[PDB]
Design a protein around this nucleic acid. Sequence first.
DNA 1: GTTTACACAAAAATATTTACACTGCCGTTTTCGAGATTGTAAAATAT
DNA 2: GCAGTGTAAATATTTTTGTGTAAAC
DNA 3: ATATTTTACAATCTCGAAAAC
Lengths: 402, 355
Amino acid sequence: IITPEKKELIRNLISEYNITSAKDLQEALKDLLGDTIQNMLEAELDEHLGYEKYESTEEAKSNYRNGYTSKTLKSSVGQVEIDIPRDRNAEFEPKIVPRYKRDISEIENKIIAMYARGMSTREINEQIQEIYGFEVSAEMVSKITDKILPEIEEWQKRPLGEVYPIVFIDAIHFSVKNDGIVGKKAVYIVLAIDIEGQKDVIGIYVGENESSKFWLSVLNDLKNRGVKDILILCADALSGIKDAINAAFPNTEYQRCIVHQIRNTLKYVSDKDRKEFARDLKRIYTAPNEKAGYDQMLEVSEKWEKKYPAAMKSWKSNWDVICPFFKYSEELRKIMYTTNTIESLNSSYRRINKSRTVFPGDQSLLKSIYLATVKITSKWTMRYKNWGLILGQLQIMFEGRI
Amino acid sequence: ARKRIITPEKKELIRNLISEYNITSAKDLQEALKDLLGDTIQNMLEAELDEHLGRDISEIENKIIAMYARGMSTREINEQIQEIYGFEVSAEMVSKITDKILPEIEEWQKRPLGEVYPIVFIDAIHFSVKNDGIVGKKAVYIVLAIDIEGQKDVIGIYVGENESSKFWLSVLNDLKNRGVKDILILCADALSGIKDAINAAFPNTEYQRCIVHQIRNTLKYVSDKDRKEFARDLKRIYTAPNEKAGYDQMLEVSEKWEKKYPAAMKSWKSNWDVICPFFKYSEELRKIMYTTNTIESLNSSYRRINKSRTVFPGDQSLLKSIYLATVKITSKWTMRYKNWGLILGQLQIMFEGRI
DNA sequence: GTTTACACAAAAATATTTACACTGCCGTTTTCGAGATTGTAAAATAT
DNA sequence: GCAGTGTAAATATTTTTGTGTAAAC
DNA sequence: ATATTTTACAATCTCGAAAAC
């Protein structure tokens, strides 16, 4: 309190609105808000209709002002009862409060943020009832979160770059209702690295289970958003990726995603033999050449086949596709296989969808994944390290490309 | 007060502020009220802790308690309260607001209990807290029983720093002082002095090792890929019709899984003789026994309330937090069980005079 | 007279239930990425 | 088995609107 | 001439989540 005018106003308020004790101050703030809204509405009515309170009109008019209504509003202070009459001919639109609005839009964004951070619709209802006094149903949360569908439709069709050096495709499965039955559907997330060294999600796609055409529709969409050339594409073995990648971007060299390979093989090992097993596995892909990597593969397979025999079978079966990973440099392959690039997104999505399991509709799952995606990408404004050297090696490998 | 007609001398106080703050929308007035009243509310609340020598309370303090109930840190509560009022929340402030509910928790921990409870579970969770300026590890034990009416109200909470038989006996005697005479079933993980105090207080009470902790502690050793089959085998372990068939299924799964996880089934084979056999009760009770997701729900909530990495010093703050977290849920899962009549009939047939 | 104020049906526009068609077997410590507060001296300011 | 879920459809709950008359001027 | 503030300058400390025991 440094303003003398506002301090005199505060004194007039405390001596005028009968401030008594702690139980009375909240009711006094509520009635203060109500009376301020009443004064503003009376001013707006006298300015719009023009006729003052019992003022001798100069001309003979046929219109009048009469009515009685009670609008039980609610705001940040809590539910507030108020009442302001209307005009006779039912022609008066209050601008401070709309003709049917009863809430405060300053908290709608916070409701959206609460839904995005992981809280459920009923949990948001409980919290709002606890801290804000008034009740907001779960269907109100659903309407609030539906009110941002055009924002998602606009986000998924934004202008992209020209050439992306590395782009990963990651599949994550969830439970959704379709055609009246709950099933397990996979939503795919495309995460690319920009030539500036930045990292950001390109797009999200749900449905059209394991179709070669669907992948092309994704790739063509990438083209329609303005993509011309992809150098590296890391993706787990799926139905129509490898087929469609040659149909859309034949110059794109394709490699099987290594971040899923290292994670999927540790599913067979125990919770205690994970530090050592990873260490040896780390030497499998940090080998200088492909023959050294194959030899380390044989060594670790023979070492851990006694306890976990089915762990290295996937490596031995797919090593032919794992081969094109030893072409890239160490500083670039490290960026390729690092856990924070892909596993962080999956862990965050699982951490936000731990409560929500059975999404009623693909729209709800898309909305949830989009909100989680924005909440994570809001923190990826950092550049990569040693990006100049990586870009030099990339231009050396792919001449005339970047 | 049939109408909202007030003294018309407030129009000056309304108009001066509405013309100074340039209030063209409700947002302007809403952001102005907090700026004008935050310091006032802060300077008024800083005197409530001094008004006492050191009956509900104000609504703002109830809101702060509700915020502290969800498991929010002081910074989260500070942001949440600046979004409305605009002032900051200190450690002494939240400490006083939590201390103001000391009579309620002290009367709840001294609340008169029932007489005979058919089934009682006890779950222990350990945390690290600062006390008297030293960091230590204290264990809080929660006793949750189901009454003969079929309800599942929480019985009590007790914190200590010792797995000693003396403390356990003192807890049981405290429960006796609360007016309990007979407990029929006691579900508890293997601890140091459990069986000693159980035989000292209720020797006729049949005591069995809690199976929900056994399946959780045994599945911790298996891998993330060989967990579905291992779970299926354990399901065949505890869904067996008789106790000997269950013993045979346990031997089978042990001999099958000793090649990959030798130390996983060792606890089962080691403790099957002394506490494992729960197979006297019927399946209508055995299902509720091995599916009691309420204990794990409470434990998961307690883990979710651990946003404060180390709890605020002194045992009183952790006790307050655990009490409010337990009450906020138990006030809404006080509903009846299903097919409880059959279980009660089986219990009265098994325990004729209710021992 | 002039103008408002007000109880009541009737209509319009939201907020809350209801139903649904299913899902769900989980730690402790280390490290990390920032955020907040302030150490710390010293550079500018002044009682 | 008990506890959750996000939203389509369906109620339930206000607000607001037609007044025909009583009050404030 | 010294005492006071605030301010660069980070510097340290602290603190809320993913990662790894």
